């Protein structure tokens, strides 16, 4: 529908707003949040991804959707890097480490 | 190529055991073919580009004394050969982080993008 | 109705569909899953849809900056945006990154500022698609200009874009994202 | 979209400045051929470039009802905007005949149009 009216002059006018505008813009954004400041700041440090996955979808109905880990992180000793690397769809055995920035779909208030 | 190999392949030099690998990847007209029989112990040409890292791998760049990347004398814009001879750095200096380069510069703006590169 | 799944199998996802209370109620094990066992205040906010954030349309010399005006204003938390655009180059449609970028899915405070930062003379060629969205600026400059960047705050900044306008013109292969990796490589230094 | 103008005539050109010249003029001649009345006439409504127009107005600017509107006609609310329902038969012409790609493609502007206005 926005394609049509887009197609009808190649802008995007817009007017007023109803109680059907505001009931749209009810959608689920993509975002990604630390692991300090959280709600699970305990479940911040060995703490299983199920575990997230399922405390964060009952309490905030944020789909957790992947674990942006750091790359000198599995590394014993430390370094000074902050390149982040991406992994997806993690399972039960994959443990947790408190400097993550784990991606997820986050809902609106 | 003439001037650098007529004062670099000249006959009052010491001890030069040092074998040109030209690599450059648009095929040379008739009269580089005369040019190069000119010096055929000394000079050795090779066809394709300085980036895809198989063509490194070809001319032995891992192990060389050190890489000359020449620039022309005239362009329509200097910022083009300038940033395609830093892109050609670039290229070799990831492939082995230990290689001399002796480049040619357009500009002066242009040459602060040298120490860029932290290699 | 359909479910988009994340698997690793077309097998796991066949499963996907096997479930009953009965059949399926107390199974932790994928393969014991596998069981066909079942029996069966009128400030205009929004645009017309009501799906993107929807200013007043404006004048370009309005968000027209010098450097040292950007250099005044601390905006942190900001999004820039390279272009290597010449007059003479080929469209890119900068709109298309706006759009989702401010996508009314967002709170009005919690928006990143864009601020592009290129040839103004081809941004005024694409800025007739993007005179609606609330909050963008122009910077006037090169991305290759380092002082451009220092007064674009881009230390204290959030990703920082990179786009290669004149993709048209192509040397070679390579040769065409050569602008592009020697930006990157600029701000890194 | 002020006046509303029924039974005229709309006329759809894709010219560029450098492209080649037409000769709209031809087009206007036996459509003003005074063997119609003055009030039987249909109005010309050129929409186009007007950077176009402006280069072949000096020999159209003698009749009496014309107009330009400086618009394209791919741009579906200019049509909205020239009452093209409420209209005669709306004439699409090609003024960049000139660039030639492949054959069929030089005619895909036109075609093109044909489409939109129909949808």
């Given at each position: 529908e926005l394609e049509a009216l887009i197609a009808e002059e190649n802008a995007l006018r817009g007017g007023y707003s109803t109680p059907q505008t505001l009931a749209n813009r009810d959608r689920c954004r993509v975002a990604q949040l630390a692991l300090l400041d959280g709600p699970f700041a305990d479940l911040g440090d060995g703490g299983c991804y199920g575990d997230l996955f399922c405390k964060a979808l009952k309490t905030y109905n944020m789909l957790c959707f992947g674990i942006y880990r750091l790359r000198d992180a599995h590394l014993s000793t430390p370094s000074q890097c902050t390149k982040r690397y991406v992994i997806t769809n993690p399972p039960y055995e994959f443990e947790l480490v408190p400097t993550d920035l784990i991606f997820c779909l986050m809902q609106f208030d | 190529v003439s001037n650098f190999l007529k004062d670099f392949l000249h006959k009052d030099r010491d001890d030069v055991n040092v074998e040109i690998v030209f690599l450059h990847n648009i095929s040379p007209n008739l009269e580089l073919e005369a040019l190069f029989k000119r010096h055929f112990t000394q000079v050795e040409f090779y066809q394709g580009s300085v980036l895809n890292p198989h063509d490194l791998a070809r001319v032995k760049?891992?192990?060389?004394?050190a890489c000359l990347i020449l620039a022309n004398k005239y362009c329509a814009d200097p910022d083009a050969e300038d940033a395609s001879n830093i892109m050609r750095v670039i290229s070799i200096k990831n492939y082995h982080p230990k290689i001399r380069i002796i480049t040619q510069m357009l500009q002066y703006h242009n040459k602060a993008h040298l120490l860029n590169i932290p290699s | 109705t359909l479910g988009f799944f994340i698997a690793s199998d077309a097998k796991e996802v066949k499963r996907a569909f096997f479930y009953c209370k009965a059949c399926h109620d107390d199974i932790t094990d994928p393969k014991r899953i596998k069981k066909c066992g079942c029996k069966r205040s009128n400030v205009k906010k929004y645009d017309s849809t009501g799906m993107f954030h929807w200013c007043a349309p404006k004048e370009i010399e309005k968000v027209i900056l010098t450097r040292s005006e950007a250099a005044m204003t601390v905006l942190s938390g900001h999004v820039v945006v390279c272009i290597f655009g010449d007059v003479s180059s080929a469209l890119i449609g900068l709109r298309n990154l706006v759009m989702p970028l401010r996508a009314s899915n967002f709170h009005y405070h919690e928006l990143k500022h864009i601020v592009f930062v290129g040839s103004i003379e081809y941004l005024k060629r694409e800025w007739e698609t993007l005179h609606n969205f609330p909050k963008v600026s122009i910077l006037p400059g090169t991305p290759l200009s380092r002082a451009d960047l220092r007064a674009v705050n881009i230390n204290l900044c959030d990703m920082c874009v990179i786009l290669s306008?004149?993709?048209?013109?192509?040397?070679?292969?390579?040769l065409q994202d050569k602008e592009c990796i020697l930006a990157s490589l600029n701000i890194k230094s």
């Open positions: - | 760049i891992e192990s060389a004394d | 306008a004149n993709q048209n013109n192509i040397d070679d292969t390579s």
